[PDB]
């Protein structure tokens, strides 16, 4: 299966690209702006089917914080430590922060 890029259109090998498990299609880091890491290399749910780690529902992209290194979804209104507002800075794991 070519599993061409989900959002960019183009064929690619299945090993050096992020392969979404649910969707079945892989994609380049540049297209979705995802850092190349072993955790995501295995295959992280692309933003097209991402879910909150609290309610397991998508949407609220501007109000949802996603980890740069690992794949985790945090809702500004129901994340692990709930916040009263949207952080002006980045809110992800320490490694994710950098």
């Amino acid at each position: 299966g070519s599993a061409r890029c989900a959002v960019c259109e183009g064929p690619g090998e299945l090993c050096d690209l992020f392969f979404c498990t649910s969707c079945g299609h892989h994609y380049h880091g540049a297209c979705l702006d995802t850092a190349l890491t072993a955790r995501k290399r295995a295959g992280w749910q692309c933003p097209e089917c991402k879910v909150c780690q609290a309610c397991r529902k998508p949407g609220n992209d501007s109000k949802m914080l996603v980890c740069e290194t690992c794949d985790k979804g945090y809702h500004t209104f129901c994340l692990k430590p709930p916040m009263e507002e949207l952080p002006a800075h980045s809110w992800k794991c320490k490694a994710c922060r950098v």
Binding site: D33, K50, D61, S62, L65, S90, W91, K92
Partner: peptide, 19 residues
């Protein structure tokens, strides 16, 4: 550094996808 995190990742995805 801004909420560009998922905001830029998924929202831009819509721009390139919907395009």
């Amino acid at each position: 550094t801004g909420a560009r995190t998922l905001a830029d990742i998924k929202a831009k995805a819509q721009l390139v996808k919907a395009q």
